[PDB]
Design a protein around this ligand. Structure first.
Ligand SMILES: [Ca+2]
Ligand SMILES: [Ca+2]
Ligand SMILES: [Ca+2]
Ligand SMILES: [Ca+2]
Ligand SMILES: [Zn+2]
Ligand SMILES: [Zn+2]
Lengths: 90, 90
């Protein structure tokens, strides 16, 4: 598989790594979201150390207002991070 | 960098590989779009061999109606493909 295919599956994989830790095996609750960011986005995003920031990032990604981030919402987050990385380097 | 970071940069990279071939170095025209799909999505999407399909896929991804696929529109395409791959395997 190509780099683009590898990327598509990596997005699926990281999501399930964190979402399947507690509660709804298919949604990132706040503590799963935090660890995903801290462990997996350490070169693109500042480490998250304050509850306020956990709350705020979820508030921002949670489009359907259920207090968790599901797969669709996670894809929106990846697009945001990707767009930011893109614009940074031109 | 983590698998998720690797994926984010791979998305940027493949885009520029194809968009910078002709015309607007930052948008995928139809022929660039076709080659990206054919060469880079061969395990997820059927090979594109008919002009009609090239036209239709662009018609579908082109949200701002400029006849090309820009970075934002490409990110929307990746999310579609990713969501389809996700749902396929559960
Ligand atoms: Ca969960
Ligand atoms: Ca939600
Ligand atoms: Ca181009
Ligand atoms: Ca367009
Ligand atoms: Zn799933
Ligand atoms: Zn660019």
């Amino acid at each position: 598989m190509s780099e683009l295919e590898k990327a598509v599956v990596a997005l699926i994989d990281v999501f399930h790594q964190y979402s399947g830790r507690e509660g709804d095996k298919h949604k990132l609750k706040k503590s799963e979201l935090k660890e995903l960011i801290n462990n997996e986005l350490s070169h693109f995003l500042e480490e998250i150390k304050e509850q306020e920031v956990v709350d705020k990032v979820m508030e921002t990604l949670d489009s359907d207002g259920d207090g968790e981030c599901d797969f669709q919402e996670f894809m929106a987050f990846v697009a945001m991070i990707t767009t930011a990385c893109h614009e940074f380097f031109e």
